[PDB]
A paper describes a structure:
PEP is a highly specific peptidase belonging to a cysteine protease family. We believe that PEP of ComA is a more suitable target for inhibitor development for the following reasons: First, PEP catalyzes the initial step of the quorum-sensing system of Streptococcus. In this study, we focused on PEP as the target of potential inhibitors of the Streptococcus quorum-sensing pathway, established a reliable high-throughput screening system using a synthetic substrate for PEP, and successfully obtained a compound that was found to allosterically inhibit PEP and suppress the quorum-sensing pathway, which eventually led to attenuated biofilm formation.
Therefore, we prepared another form of MuPEP1 with the four N-terminal residues truncated (tMuPEP1), a form that was found to be crystallized in a different space group from that of MuPEP1. We also tested several synthetic analogs of Compound 1 and revealed the structure of tMuPEP1 in complex with Compound 2 at a 3.1 Å resolution. The electron density of v-shaped Compound 2 was clearly observed in a pocket composed of β-strand (Phe63–Lys69), α-helix (Asp71–Tyr77), loop (Asn78–Pro83), Ala70, and the side chain of Phe137. The binding is mainly mediated through hydrophobic and van der Waals interactions. A few hydrogen bonds might also contribute, but the interactions cannot be specified at this resolution. Although the physiological function of this relatively hydrophobic pocket is unknown, the residues interacting with Compound 2 are conserved among Streptococcus PEPs (dots). Superimposition of the acyl-intermediate model and the tMuPEP1-Compound 2 complex structure showed direct collision between the bound inhibitor and some residues lining the pocket. Taken together, the following inhibition mechanism is proposed: After substrate binding, PEP catalysis proceeds via an acyl-intermediate-like transition state in which a pocket on the protein surface is compressed. When an inhibitor binds to this pocket, the inhibitor prevents the structural changes and non-competitively inhibits the PEP activity.
Author numbering:
A (entry chain A): 6 to 141
B (entry chain B): 6 to 25, 39 to 140
Write the structure that this text describes.
Amino acid sequence: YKLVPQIDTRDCGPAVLASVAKHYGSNYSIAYLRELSKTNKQGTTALGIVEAAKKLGFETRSIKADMTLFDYNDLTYPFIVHVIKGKRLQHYYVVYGSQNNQLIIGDPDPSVKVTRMSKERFQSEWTGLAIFLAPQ
Amino acid sequence: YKLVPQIDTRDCGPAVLASVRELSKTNKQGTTALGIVEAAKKLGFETRSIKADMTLFDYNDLTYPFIVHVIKGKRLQHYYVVYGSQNNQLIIGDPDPSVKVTRMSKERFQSEWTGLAIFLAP
Ligand SMILES: CCCNC(=O)OC[C@H]1C[C@@H]2CCN1C[C@@H]2c1cc(-c2ccc(OC)cc2)nn1C
């Protein structure tokens, strides 16, 4: 699971983006994506992630789902989620898949990176917003 | 229920801040929840933000009014004002000038809400 850790506090949005591109081929510098995604001091908005994704030639959709979303096997990984971690309100993960009760996620937090996560935990952080991407 | 409707598709954050003009690190995409907070702190507010679920509305302490981050269709950084939980239905304010204040079912609200609530007091 090819994931790009962040470094500046604000980078999480650019980072999940780039993590996604790598997977589906492309490479892209985070400072660039900062400027594309209109990431500012307080991270990126959900919107910013989208516009950007579109401009890298991605077919983007976003939805409000609930946990049941993960009961459906055609779910095309990877994709992005908006989550809340403690005081980080504009955080995001990459979702790679799910062997077991558990999700394979990538937290651009360089101290976490890719990791398994329980669904209780995930539910409790996840905003319901998912952003699905595929190349055009 | 004092609510200030918005004008541009971006003002929704400033608009909910209207809580009893033009500001606060609000860029071309509405705002971040972060921005709403900082701002609220300016204006002299004590700000508590938390991830909740619907059980939150089971709380008799619940200090209305307060703010929520919700998704409306493809408006991903939208927000409402929550005025009260008078029964199985909520009193909300949608800065969307075509909606403004309105009752809302909890199934509907659950379906739009991101879980994020931001509580303010002077
Ligand atoms: C600043 C004004 C609000 N201050 C505040 O501390 O929170 C408002 C109320 C609601 C409720 C009772 C007292 N206080 C905090 C309480 C609450 C509910 C919840 C809650 C947390 C998680 C939930 O789902 C996962 C649900 C509710 N947390 N908390 C702290």
